[PDB]
Amino acid sequence: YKNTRKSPALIVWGIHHSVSTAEQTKLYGSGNKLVTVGSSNYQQSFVPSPGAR
């Protein structure tokens, strides 16, 4: 996404922590899951932590 506007844009997003790896693999497929986010200022990467809450 490119912010074409004159004001800073509030970008929000979620990372899903499924109840179990079984649930995680059933929804988003098997294998190690990984989400990265990057800009000029901000950079951060995320891996899901499945488990019971």
Binding site: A22, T25, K26, S30
Partner: protein, 213 residues
């Protein structure tokens, strides 16, 4: 939605190991959870597997779940069969808001050697042809295990309308018997060239044919 397909008949000797497969028509098998229910005759079903491999507390460790994404199949597996494992086994899966049940599988622990069924196929009596009715009788006796599949064919072609098939019941000699009655009208009876009753047992087919006069 989709449909699940298990074999009708599975048999093995005590202590041996069976597998009951369950194949999904549409959609991957690993896109939702699969169950395995068991129904011992005369009792409600109980669940021996959930989330495709998980045993409820109180289910012997010989039961296992599995998922083969290549064949799009989910497979129950029973090690060291007991005599109390003889039941019907239904697989189950899920879609948008739809709960799909497998056809059911009859698991037989062999207590006597297998015996192919004996088929005796009768035409309609001329007296019923006077009542403007027509009924075909396919009598199936002395088979073990107690699982059969009855298919009728109108001269070369499956006919499923008007068929009534009995659930196999044990005879006097610890072998199973069944019946299958195809209902027709005399105009359809004299119409075709021949009528057949196909009984399928343990992967073998015994076909018998009858004809007008």
């Amino acid at each position: 939605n989709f449909m699940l397909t298990q074999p009708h008949s599975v048999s093995e000797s005590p202590g041996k190991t069976v597998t009951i497969s369950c194949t999904r028509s549409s959609g991957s098998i690993a896109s939702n959870y699969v169950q395995w229910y068991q129904q011992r005759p005369g009792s409600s079903p109980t669940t021996v597997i959930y989330e495709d491999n998980q045993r409820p507390s109180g289910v012997p460790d010989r039961f296992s779940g599995s998922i083969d994404s290549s064949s799009n199949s989910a497979s129950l597996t029973i090690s060291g069969l007991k005599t109390e494992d003889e039941a019907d086994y239904y697989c189950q899966s899920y879609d948008s808001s739809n709960v799909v049940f497998g056809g059911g599988t009859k698991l037989t622990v062999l207590g006597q050697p297998k015996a192919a069924p004996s088929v005796t196929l009768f035409p309609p009596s001329s007296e019923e042809l006077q009542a403007n009715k027509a009924t075909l009788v396919c009598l199936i006796s002395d088979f073990y295990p107690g699982a059969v599949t009855v298919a009728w064919k109108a001269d070369s072609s499956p006919v499923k309308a008007g068929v009534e098939t009995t659930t196999p019941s044990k005879q006097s000699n610890n072998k199973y018997a069944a019946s299958s009655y195809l209902s027709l009208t005399p105009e359809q009876w004299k119409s075709h060239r021949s009528y057949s009753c196909q009984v399928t047992h343990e992967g073998s087919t015994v076909e018998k044919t009858v004809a007008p006069t």
